[PDB]
Amino acid sequence: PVQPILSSTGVKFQVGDLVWSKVGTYPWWPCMVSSDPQLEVHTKINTRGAREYHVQFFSNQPERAWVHEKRVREYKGHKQYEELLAEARPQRERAQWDIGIAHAEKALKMTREERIEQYTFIYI
């Protein structure tokens, strides 16, 4: 542990699109592109000029994050995970990933419009 402070583009995805997202130390997670409830945007540009996407996790958890374009890939099927692991977990986390994959595979059978109506997060 060393304190770092001691030293001191086209839109590819729309709301409802199925994606793979890499957030923190989580593995590639099945997600849906959605609009941020506060910002009312699904995509934005960094102070460095890079594109970012707001994604909601397929899980039993209401997980959401603003992910960099390099960590957002198209979801074509659950077997695509092996390709993502080739490019490069707790029991409770593996169970929520399996629940995620189960619903993402169901969402692939639906249209983008249908995915929004069934899986968009409830905000209060």
Swiss-Prot record:
Domain (PWWP) ranges: 15-78
Tissue occurrence: Highly expressed in brain, heart and skeletal muscle. Expressed at lower level in liver and lung.
TM ranges: none
Subcellular location: Nucleus; Chromosome
Cysteines joined through disulfide linkages: none
Cleavable signal peptide: none
Subunit structure: Interacts with BRD4. Interacts (via KIKL motif) with BRD3 (via NET domain).
Disease cited in the entry: Defects in NSD3 may be involved in non small cell lung carcinomas (NSCLC). Amplified or overexpressed in NSCLC.
Comment on protein domains: The KIKL motif recognizes and binds the NET domain of BRD3.
Function: Histone methyltransferase. Preferentially dimethylates 'Lys-4' and 'Lys-27' of histone H3 forming H3K4me2 and H3K27me2. H3 'Lys-4' methylation represents a specific tag for epigenetic transcriptional activation, while 'Lys-27' is a mark for transcriptional repression.
Family that this chain belongs to: Belongs to the class V-like SAM-binding methyltransferase superfamily. Histone-lysine methyltransferase family. SET2 subfamily.
Protein's name according to its UniProt entry: Histone-lysine N-methyltransferase NSD3
Organism field: Homo sapiens (Human)
Segment of the intact protein contained: 249 to 395 of 1437
